[PDB]
DNA sequence: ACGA
């Protein structure tokens, strides 16, 4: 009955405690979720350099090609519609540096638009892939960035959701070995 | 030493 779903986000730069979410994303075995975001500060020139994300004015741009967004609040539901009707089974979180990163972000975020306690009704606990490379190829392994780990196994949300679920099928983690790498949301 |  359980069911993984493996998230991730673009944001507006590297500090968890003030970034904006840019796109967030989500796969779980062949459903997939994904939204842009009008961010509500500016993203960084080294964040825009990483995902090619830019804002001009109010239209946010990937490369050269504008995007739709999604208002903060019906993304954010969506989102949790998404944990609450579409993974046909009782989701759990799996995101690379979700710990450190991607669930403090999105925490902040939810709660600045009163969902958190609604989100953590849908969901509970929630898997970090890079302490759990890490732990499976320690002493194997010297880089466990994303990127590198797709390129050796096999920034754009959709197509990293993807890669995650794909890498995670390729290395097949034990559930002991899972469990080592879950937190509580 | 990872994330954007
Ligand atoms: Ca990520």
Not at 73 to 84: D, K, M, S, V
Request: proline residues 4%.
């Amino acid at each position: 009955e359980e069911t993984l779903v493996f998230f991730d986000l673009e944001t507006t730069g590297l500090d968890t405690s003030r970034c904006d979410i840019v796109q967030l994303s989500a796969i779980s075995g062949t459903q997939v979720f994904s939204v842009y975001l009008l961010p509500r500060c500016c993203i960084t020139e080294g964040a825009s350099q990483v995902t090619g994300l830019w804002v001009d004015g109010s239209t946010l741009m990937l490369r050269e090609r504008p995007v739709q967004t999604v208002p903060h609040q019906q993304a954010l539901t969506g989102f949790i519609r998404f944990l609450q009707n579409q993974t046909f089974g009782r989701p759990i979180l799996v995101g690379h540096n979700s710990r450190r990163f991607d669930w403090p972000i999105l925490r902040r975020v939810l709660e600045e638009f009163g969902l958190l306690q609604e989100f953590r009704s849908c969901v509970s606990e929630c898997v970090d892939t890079l302490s759990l490379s890490r732990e499976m190829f320690r002493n194997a392994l010297q880089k466990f960035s994303q990127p590198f780990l797709v390129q050796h196994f096999l920034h754009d949300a959709s197509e990293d959701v993807r890669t995650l679920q794909e890498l995670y099928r390729v290395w097949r983690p034990s559930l002991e070995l899972r469990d080592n790498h879950t937190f509580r949301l």
